[PDB]
Amino acid sequence: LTEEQIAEFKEAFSLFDKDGDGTITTKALGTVMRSLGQNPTEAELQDMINEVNGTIDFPAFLTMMARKMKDTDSEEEIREAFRVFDKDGNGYISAAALRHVMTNLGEKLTDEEVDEMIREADIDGQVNYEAFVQMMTA
Amino acid sequence: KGCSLTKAQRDSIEVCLLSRPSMMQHLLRRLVFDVPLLNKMPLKLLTNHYERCWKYYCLPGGASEEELHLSRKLFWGIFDALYEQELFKLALPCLSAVAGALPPNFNPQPVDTSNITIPEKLEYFINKYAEHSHDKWSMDKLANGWIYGEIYSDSSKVQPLMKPYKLLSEKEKEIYRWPIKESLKTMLAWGWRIERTREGDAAHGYSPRAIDMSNVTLSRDLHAMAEMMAENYHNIWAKKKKLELESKGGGNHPLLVPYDTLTAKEKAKDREKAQDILKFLQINGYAVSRGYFLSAASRPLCSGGHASNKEKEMVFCKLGVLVRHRISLFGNDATLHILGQTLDARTVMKTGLESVKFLDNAAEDLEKTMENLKQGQFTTTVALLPMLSSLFEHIGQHQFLEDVQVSCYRILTSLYALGTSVERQRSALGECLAAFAGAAFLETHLDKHNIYS
């Protein structure tokens, strides 16, 4: 999470608020999102209102906006994380390099996890990373 | 919610995937009933699911095959417009290949019921058919044994409706004459002819001399007429029920579904009402009249339409050209008057779109010509004319960055299709080869050495 995004979201929510106790109307959600550049469809706006009473509160608004932001951020991060390796531009990962980089910092547990990756990865050995994404993210 | 609607869609696809293909065809009935408005993306998703079901009902599943022929005609007709429609059209080539592996708020539509009159040759006929219908209805009541008396009470088996043809007044008959006569006025409306032929033939109350009206059966188009009038009876009764339940101010009743998603008893009653006329006509001798292979039959018609479209397709109907390439590949998966006509139309379309050789057509023409060359043996001495046509095509593709190799591989596919089992075109290809030799070249050299046989 970045700081001025939080500042802008707070300022927009309070800008379209009047009394100041976390109480705006439900229909002004579309207005405050299109002031923030967000424009989903009508049923998605309704589903996000039903995710929230009549008065939209502040932190869950931040949480849903965090979901919508970290979606595209997660795509660009899984882009840049494997643009660290694999300089050619095909997104293809050799399995010996999988044995190398799978024991990375953060988790770095034993041979169980790297055998768990190697038993099912599809190996032509250059492996496309989207199979790894579909594997790990259930 | 679009997420919740897509969740329901995935649930329905999983319910329809692993469930034999009998109920799958029963659902594909309603799927084809709603699919004709594909020209609304959810109908295209349901059509992709039905194409997967046809891929599940091709060999053993693919009666309803005539309904499959009408459904394939509707899929040819509604998708004759020229995205998600590209996905449904990619499903539609699998639908056509599976149909060749087979060949290996709804609102009812009423017609007017009392505006077309009755001929008198049936007015000397209803005057005894009403007595015979009272015979059969009285036999149906005496199956219980309703004995007429003075007190009309249904405890000791007494109806006030077991009375003969003579005691009935001028309005007691018309109560039960009314739906039968106002269905005769519908059957006599559309232009149907029942003309002169040969003639023919306990308990208390009314004991009839009734002919057994239970075991008389017509033929195919005659029962098609009877089924259309049963759908007319059901649509009038559904209009009656839907203008009966819209007179209060509430909701409805949940049987208001498409016509191919219903039960049989409500249609069996309408079947008996439609066909007690027809059984009595076949007993007395009065006849009833009007008054697969169709895919390969219309494949020459579709091929001629595709050539006439591909003559001047330089505008968004190149998706139709990709659909025609996919339909030809599906016919290759499902393969000679119409076949020779399709090969000649493939040559004519390869010559007609040779001068402009849209965007996906520029890559799809190679796939279409290769599929036709491979299917040319899976299906005739004037081929020097289309050979000179392809010679001019390669002359228009030589100087107009891998198009020369595409022309060389197309000549390879042409010579391989001619050699799968007049020498003007050889002179033209050698002329272009010697013209473009000093200035896609090595592939042409190894393609001429591969199409040399």
Keywords:
part of a larger assembly, 2 chains, A: 138 residues, mainly alpha, two-stranded antiparallel sheet, 7 helices, 2 strands, elongated, B: 453 residues, Calmodulin-1 (chain A), adenylate cyclase activator activity (chain A), titin binding (chain A), calcium channel regulator activity (chain A)
Shape of chain A: elongated
Q: Helix amount of chain A, in percent?
A: 55-70%
> What portion of the residues of chain A fall into strands of 2 or more residues?
under 5%
Report the end-to-end length of chain B measured between terminal Cα atoms.
Answer: 62 Å
Radius of gyration of chain B: 32 Å
Largest sheet of chain A: 2 strands, antiparallel
Give a written overview of the molecule:
Chain A: There is a cross-link at residue 18 (Glycyl lysine isopeptide (Lys-Gly) (interchain with G-Cter in SUMO2)). Chain A: Residues 69-138 are annotated as: Necessary and sufficient for interaction with PCP4. Chain A: The modification N6-acetyllysine is found at residues 18, 87. The structure is cut from a larger assembly and holds chains A (138 residues) and B (453 residues). By secondary structure, chain A is mainly alpha-helical. Helix content of chain A is 58%, strand content 3%. A two-stranded antiparallel ribbon of chain A has the order 1-2. In chain A, α5 (95-102) runs antiparallel to α6. The two termini of chain A are 25 Å apart. Chain B contains 18 helices and no strands. The chains are: A mainly alpha (138), B mainly alpha (453). Chains A and B meet through α3 of A and α1 of B.
